[PDB]
Paper text:
At the virion five-fold symmetry axes, the trimeric attachment protein, σ1, extends from pentameric turrets formed by the λ2 protein. Reovirus attachment is thought to proceed via a two-step adhesion-strengthening mechanism, in which σ1 first engages widely distributed carbohydrate receptors with lower affinity. To enhance an understanding of mechanisms by which viral attachment proteins engage cell-surface glycans, we determined the crystal structure of T3D σ1 in complex with α-2,3-sialyllactose, α-2,6-sialyllactose, and α-2,8-disiallylactose. The structure of σ1 residues 170 to 455 reveals a highly elongated, symmetric trimer that measures about 200 Å in length.
To elucidate the structural basis of the interaction of the reovirus attachment protein σ1 with its carbohydrate coreceptor, we prepared a complex by soaking crystals of σ1 with 10 mM α-2,3-sialyllactose, a compound that terminates in α-linked sialic acid. The subsequent structure, determined at 2.25 Å resolution, unambiguously demonstrated the location of the carbohydrate in an unbiased difference electron-density map. The oligosaccharide binds in a shallow groove next to the loop connecting the second and third β-spiral repeats. The σ1 protein contains three identical binding sites, one on each chain, and all three are occupied by α-2,3-sialyllactose molecules, with the sialic acid making identical and extensive contacts in each chain. The lactose moieties face different directions, probably as a result of internal flexibility and participation in crystal contacts. Arg202 forms a bidentate salt bridge with the carboxyl group. A single hydrogen bond links the hydroxyl group at C4 to the carbonyl of Gly205. The amide of the N-acetyl group is engaged in a hydrogen bond with the backbone carbonyl of Leu203, and the N-acetyl methyl group is facing into a partially hydrophobic cavity. The glycerol chain lies parallel to the peptide backbone, forming direct hydrogen bonds with the backbone carbonyl of Ile201 and the amide nitrogen of Leu203 and in some of the binding sites water-mediated hydrogen bonds with the Asn210 side chain and the amide nitrogen of Ile211. The α-2,3-sialyllactose and α-2,8-disialyllactose ligands assume an elongated shape in which the lactose groups face away from the protein.
Author numbering:
A (entry chain A): 166 to 455
B (entry chain C): 165 to 455
C (entry chain B): 161 to 455
């Protein structure tokens, strides 16, 4: 006659009419009750009536009872990356050059045509103009060489007369003026001897020109052509030791040959005479150039 | 006196034929003879440190307010890389620099009339010739003075006409013509003519007789057709009736150019009765018109 | 056994077991519950915990998380998209610039420094060379857009209305003349008209006072010779002057030249050719030229 408990299955056990329960770590006594033991704080908690897992709600969420990352935890990142992607420089076209390693951007330039200003600005390399005399640099700009516009010199030499067997020479001191493309030889008045109706007066430029003027500087632009250039009247006083009679003769530049300028002197009739008084005469003609 | 004790039990305990047993669902099991929590596999749960704990990579996660939270260090590398780019990078380009945001290509806009890219990828200014106006011209590569302006020679073969006080006559002559800088020089030779008046005109007809490429217009003075007294000078003219000429000192000047005809005034110095005149060679010069 | 009270079966129990009126029960905290007749772990809601595979398991997205050494670990693939997008930018991007290229690191704006005098940005936004007027010096000048010769240098005309004064061995007098003036290249030409004067000597001076009488744009200084105030024998020529005392003129072939310009007065020398007794002089028209001073 017994209706009590005389044996028990694990985790229950009986000793001397007293029953106890064996518990592994994880299960514990809480007051009079059996409880799940959760040491420390590892995201597990007894709450809302049972065992739950706890997670930051800004970083995590539960989807089909699975722990899942909140898609927003990445938004800040993708936002910053999308900001750069939408508009940035990845490649550069010449003259632009991009070193993909040091990520430095520079530009290729021709050093003969372009340069870098002290203030880092791109400037066109200034160049001096290529000029040919009489065009020249005048106080910094493209101008006309002063030497072309006016050059003064001097000739101290021999004038020779020759006509119909009559011959004689005189020495003159003469200013020379070169102005643009003309030379002017300013012969002074002088005395000579008999002259023919027609004859030539020769200026020997082979010697007597003041340095640095040279014989070749007196060559006409028509070189050694025979011309009738600069024709004019000259009044020459003819006498035989008394009052001279003035004859109106015709004079022109006739020919330059090897540094000797020949002038023709003819016309106006003549008289018997032994001496001639010549006026100052300026003789001009276009000058040779290179 | 018998104390017979427990005779019934409530779930999860039950008694049958004097034996008590405890029923268990999955999750609860026996570890020997002790009650235990069942954790199949490896899902982050473990019995450790006295009980049930959740396990996590300590470099990626931390526990804050007993809440599983992402450790910030996890993003440190991402934040450093993006920050390194953000601090300095090109997002926009100002002209002439151009940025195509859809291809990430940076190029530059250049005017192809003044600039270009050479064979070595360098930016170079186009070579350009100076813009020059005659008589300034290119002389052997440089900016110089046109040789043609400095000296040009031609020739006129034509008629000089005298006119004075009902006297008229003509003489065919040839004459070299020299144009030098802004002057023209017409080099007439000596010639014989007929009776002249005390005062009168000598006219050169340039409408014909000029040697190509010279044209009539090239003989126009810089003062055009105004009446002037230019290049006044003395000319001795021999007058006679067949005998020995008597030379009159007359006064000659350029008076007017009209329709290709250059008129020279010739007057002064007196006159005598005569039928013939011996004219000296005369050079006529004046500043010449230009464009 | 003299024991006054005999215990049979189970008469007491340790917590969590308890006995009331011969019934044994189990006390349970939240987290433990009854599923039918069985003890069960209670998992309220859905928080990643589940009874499955025979026990208590934790559930996680298998694309985002993984288990290493029974630890919850972030699956490395979840940052792959981010690491590639960033890396793509890294391999090639402009971080810095070298002058004249200029990058504002704070606005992400790239531009280029240029000289405003030698370079410009045209209408179509291109970089173009600034068209610049060449540095010229008169008489070289701009002529309809090209480097040319100033028309003013090539030919300029005016007039002098003034006094010509004769002086010579006591004989002196003056006459008013209107004279065209032409300046051509580096020369000045004074075109004196014919005029009448009084007694002249064998040698004498004819002076032109340019201090007054010049018509603008000409000024006195414009008549200075290129040889300044040197005494010269320039442009020497023959001039026939008619001498008389009321009757028939006798024409003397005299010799005239430009001799000296001083303080705006151009002095011409007139000598030679003999002379006679006379009270009147009939001068011809005479053009006087010389090279002109410049700057
Ligand atoms: C996630 C968590 O909170 N874990 C706790 C656990 C769980 O709450 C428990 O395992 C669920 O069954 O408990 C831990 O022990 C604490 C717990 O027993 C409570 C119960 O009241 O007492 C805490 O300290 C008490 C202490 O008993 C008193 O003497 C003291 O005067 O007051 C304290 C509280 O103010 C226990 O420490 C555990 O280790 O299992 C603590 C975990 O953090
Ligand atoms: C995270 C982890 O380590 N999971 C283990 C678990 C847990 O450690 C365990 O549930 C905590 O209580 O153990 C696992 O292996 C056990 C499992 O096969 C059970 C099934 O009943 O048997 C266990 O051996 C027991 C056995 O059941 C008893 O008869 C014996 O008297 O005691 C043994 C020791 O407790 C295994 O250890 C599991 O699957 O639950 C393996 C997981 O990896
Ligand atoms: C993570 C999870 O699944 N949580 C469940 C839990 C766990 O399954 C359980 O605690 C583990 O032991 O169960 C919850 O209760 C549900 C559970 O008891 C089932 C058992 O079959 O019944 C559900 O009630 C339903 C029932 O299924 C229907 O037959 C009935 O007609 O309607 C009821 C609902 O009105 C329980 O909801 C729990 O809260 O512990 C539910 C969790 O979501």
């Amino acid at each position: 006659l017994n209706q009590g408990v005389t044996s028990a299955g694990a985790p229950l056990s009986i000793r001397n009419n007293r029953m106890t329960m064996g518990l592994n770590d994880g299960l514990t006594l809480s007051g009079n009750n059996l409880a799940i033991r959760l040491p420390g704080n590892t995201g597990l908690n007894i709450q809302n009536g049972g065992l739950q897992f706890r997670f930051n709600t800004d970083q995590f969420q539960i989807v089909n009872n699975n722990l899942t990352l909140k898609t927003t935890v990445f938004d800040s990142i993708n936002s910053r990356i999308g900001a750069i992607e939408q508009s940035y420089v990845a490649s550069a076209v010449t003259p632009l050059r991009l070193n993909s390693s040091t990520k430095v951007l520079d530009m290729l330039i021709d050093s003969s045509t372009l340069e870098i200003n002290s203030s880092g600005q791109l400037t066109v390399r200034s160049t001096s103009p290529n000029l040919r005399y009489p065009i020249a640099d005048v106080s910094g700009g493209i101008g006309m060489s002063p030497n072309y516009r006016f050059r003064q010199s001097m000739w101290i030499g021999i004038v020779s007369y020759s006509g119909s067997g009559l011959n004689w020479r005189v020495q003159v001191n003469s200013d020379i003026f070169i102005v643009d493309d003309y030379i002017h030889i300013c012969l002074p008045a002088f005395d000579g001897f008999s002259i023919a109706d027609g004859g030539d007066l020769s200026l020997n430029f082979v010697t007597g020109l003041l340095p640095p003027l040279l014989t070749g500087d007196t060559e006409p632009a028509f070189h050694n052509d025979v011309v009738t250039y600069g024709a004019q009247t000259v009044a020459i006083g003819l006498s035989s030791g008394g009052t001279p009679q003035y004859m109106s003769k015709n004079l022109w530049v006739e020919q330059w040959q090897d540094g000797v300028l020949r002038l023709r002197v003819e016309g106006g009739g003549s008289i018997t005479h032994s001496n001639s008084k010549w006026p100052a005469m300026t003789v001009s003609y276009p000058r040779s150039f290179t």
